């Protein structure tokens, strides 16, 4: 089939975690799959980014209350006709 073929014919953005999980299930006897679980949890988070979303929600929740805002090397936004202006 078209298992892990990308838009450009290469590999998906989550092919490595899936191939790791299929290594896990290839060497695992059935009903011993409970040791195989962490590769799976890594794969589902590669697909949907759920734990990353919850973590960035908590970081933004602590960030958004403060009156100081930001004391860090900032992230500067530019317009598209000025990528390499300066």
């Amino acid at each position: 089939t078209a298992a892990g073929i990308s838009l450009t014919g290469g590999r998906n953005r989550c092919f490595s975690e899936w191939q790791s999980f299929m290594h896990c299930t290839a060497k695992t006897d059935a009903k011993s799959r409970a040791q195989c679980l962490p590769n799976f949890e890594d794969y589902m988070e590669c697909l949907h980014h759920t734990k990353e979303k919850a973590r960035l929600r908590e970081i933004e929740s602590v960030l958004k209350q403060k009156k100081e805002g930001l004391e860090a090397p900032p992230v500067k936004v530019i317009p598209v006709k000025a990528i390499g202006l300066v």
Binding site: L7, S16, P73, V75, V77, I78, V80, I83
Partner: protein, 171 residues
Amino acid sequence: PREAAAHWVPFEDKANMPDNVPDVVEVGATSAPLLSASYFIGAKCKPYNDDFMLCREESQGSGAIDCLKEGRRVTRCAVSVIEDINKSCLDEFRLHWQCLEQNNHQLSGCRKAEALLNKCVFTKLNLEKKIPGLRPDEEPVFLKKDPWIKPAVDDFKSVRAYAEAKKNGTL
């Protein structure tokens, strides 16, 4: 590996390489010079490029963080080749990529300044173009005479330089 969006918003980060990765001498060459010098930095830095892609292979997923040591060394030796081709054949190199900046950067359109550059670099810098994967009794395409695919306009300065190289006998 992905094509941009409905509304993508560009941003940069005024930050620094933190503590332990030393400073490097990065390639400041545009598309025409490194497309011109591609076979020569592929001919000199073959095992360093091979070593970098091998190290990127063996640390699966570690990847980016793992071989900082070694993508340091492909940049250094590619910069070495292009400094050498500057000081060697700046005029004819410049002729080749002033040709190749027209014609969509199609390599097809600039045989004439190319062969001149290849003589110059094979003489002073002794590196040679090869198309690998090419079994024998198959002529490499930048050697053949009367090709089917000829450019629209032969550019003027390489016509003149190739004719003068004919007259001098260096070609």
